[PDB]
Design a protein around this ligand. Structure first.
Ligand code: 722
Ligand code: 722
Ligand code: MG
Ligand code: MG
Ligand code: MG
Ligand code: MG
Ligand code: MG
Ligand code: MG
Lengths: 358, 359
């Protein structure tokens, strides 16, 4: 049911956007078709966990005429597409920044045979523009519209700042200077857990966890009813854990299962694996890592992977997850006390996250 | 005076942005410093024509005042002025990447800076646009016009992105546009028409460069409905097209030391005004020579393209285009003057900064 009404709204959104282009933007059938294809390829094919979370949060809150349930759930569907379109935008641009090769089982957008890198940058930016155009059209008469967009934009800003932390994490920040080139860091002194937690809170947690929850509360007209301090705590914790999972899968999960090929080693990413290895590694192991990290060469990449599993990273990961599960379990209860329905949706979202194989 | 106040507001905006980053976004001093230099390098050093137009429009409609209104309206115009300047900073960072340009305002392009990676350049560009919204929400939090301002700003942004699509695909046979299948640069140039040129330029340039500063100037001075918008838009579209025609001509013939940037249109195979105007008047032999030399980095080939443009008397065509434009502009400004004399004057001022620009 929820996937069926979501996909119906997708066609609703797609039709508005593409007809507007024909009718008001002097667009030709060839480019309209190109953009329809761009939209489908970049926005569909995933699990829709972000978008679906908005629907479930809204559905969980309708109580605390059947025309209202219809309206609230349709609003949740549009908001769900706002986040999925936003992540579509993120993934198109990120795939360029990360020099990735596949995504969701297909080439990355920028790697598509007739998509130029210059068009791909623009296509990715069209995706974000669509998030605002859909909000403005579908929520024109909603009083929550300003708050919604104010919050969406702040989250987007936050993610961009997080992306900056990600993309500059392998350069000595003391030597960060537009006028002067600098190679990848050689001492990895900034590959700390503290610096890792910052990247991840900003690049992943706000838009992946907080935003779907907040938008669900908004379309429900239920935002002031919850503990937003507790709610943000949960989002940050779940979001960090989600990204630790992503980093671990990048290295250890066969690409066929994930739909994408991992680039973190090659890109010299400040991943969870890297910070946790270096914090506990002997000097000899750190030497090996340094001589093999941030290179395309497959044997060097295999050597890093070898180092990770020799330093018992799976030991650290099981213990991390248990510590997270513990704190998550506790915070949901704090939430349950005053917001039983919302806590239930958060609990469902956790169920989607804990020990995911994705 | 306009520049004095404008530049004071720049520091105000910069301080809000960078201190929020430090206080609320856990940013370290090194990256605060990176961002400060990115902001200054990408947003400063131009002519600020878009931004200063917002101030001029507002200052013109400032008659319809004990000083408190004036103080507020002019500060709001300065903030909107920077919104557009920061939006343009965003466009230029990403556009220089897309267009494979080398220099900008006499410096390397942002993405060409020794310590800026292409991947950071892309994100930096995106941060510049985020900043337009953040400064709006901060300075205009309590303004009734906020929602309307943000709505129009956003539509114009999207319009410009659509125009950029037109620009970047204009050298690809659109019938064969297909993500799944590779395709080379057009060999027949069948789509290098004036009709397609006018659409690229209307969307990529006219809306944000001419319409938006005027509209914003009117919004902050609370005078938007006082103006014939049909005529205003007509004016913006005409001036905006002519501005881009000037940009295309300068790309080919103006030395880069005066430009500040090295032209790429011939090399990138852009559907420029020169190209479409040349193709529409050229003999078969000329067109054949054009086809053999356009869209190449080769210094000899670009030189041949420039010569063919000279041989075709495009400089003559330009003078007549410019005269046709200037006549319509003058007439439309008079149409405006009848019921909007103050706004009409600010539009005259804008045209004056446009007409026969050396740039
Ligand atoms: C213009 C730049 C947009 C700014 C925000 C881009 C954010 O992109 C993000 C944020 C979080 C995760 N991801 C994708 C993850 P992926 O493993 O799905 O590529 P990554 O962090 O390992 O690269 C992309
Ligand atoms: C990545 C998404 C960006 C969205 C739209 C950016 C549009 O950029 C534009 C629009 C008009 C003029 N310019 C700069 C001009 P330039 O001669 O200063 O490079 P160009 O049109 O000849 O490339 C850039
Ligand atoms: Mg990535
Ligand atoms: Mg990434
Ligand atoms: Mg990843
Ligand atoms: Mg361009
Ligand atoms: Mg350019
Ligand atoms: Mg140009």
């Amino acid at each position: 049911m929820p996937m069926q009404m979501f996909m119906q709204v997708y066609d609703e959104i797609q039709m508005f956007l593409l007809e507007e282009l024909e009718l008001k933007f002097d667009m030709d059938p060839n480019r309209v078709r190109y953009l329809r294809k761009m939209m489908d390829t970049t926005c569909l094919g995933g699990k829709y966990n972000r978008g679906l979370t908005v629907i479930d949060v809204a559905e969980s809150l309708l109580s605390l005429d059947g025309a209202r349930r219809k309206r609230v759930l349709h609003d949740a569907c549009v908001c769900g597409w706002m986040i999925e379109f936003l992540q579509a935008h993120y993934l198109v641009e990120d795939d360029i920044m990360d020099n990735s090769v596949t995504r969701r089982g297909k080439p990355c957008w920028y790697r598509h045979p007739d998509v130029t890198v210059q068009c791909a940058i623009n296509d990715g930016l069209l995706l974000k523009s669509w998030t605002h155009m859909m909000a403005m059209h579908f929520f024109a008469d909603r009083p929550f519209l300003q708050d919604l967009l104010c919050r969406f934009n702040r989250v987007d800003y936050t993610t961009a700042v997080g992306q900056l932390y990600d993309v500059t994490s392998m350069f000595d920040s003391n030597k960060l200077d537009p006028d002067v080139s600098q190679p990848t860091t050689t001492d990895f002194a900034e590959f700390t857990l503290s610096n890792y937690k910052r990247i991840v809170k900003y690049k992943t947690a706000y838009y992946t966890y907080l935003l779907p929850l907040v938008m669900g509360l908004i379309v429900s007209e239920a935002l002031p009813t919850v503990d937003m301090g507790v709610t943000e705590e949960l989002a940050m914790l779940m979001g960090e854990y989600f990204q630790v999972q992503d980093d671990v899968m990048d290295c250890f999960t066969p690409p066929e299962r994930l739909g994408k090929v991992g680039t973190d080693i090659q890109d010299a990413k400040c991943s969870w694996l890297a910070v946790t290895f270096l914090a506990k590694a002997s000097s000899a192991q750190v030497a090996e890592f340094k001589a093999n990290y941030g290179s395309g060469d497959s044997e060097k990449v295999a050597t890093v992977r070898r180092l990770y599993e020799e330093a018992d990273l799976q030991g650290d990961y099981v213990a991390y997850e248990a510590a997270v599960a513990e704190q998550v379990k506790e915070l949901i209860e704090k939430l349950r006390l005053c917001s039983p329905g919302f806590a239930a949706s958060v609990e469902t979202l956790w169920g989607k996250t804990y020990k995911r194989q994705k």
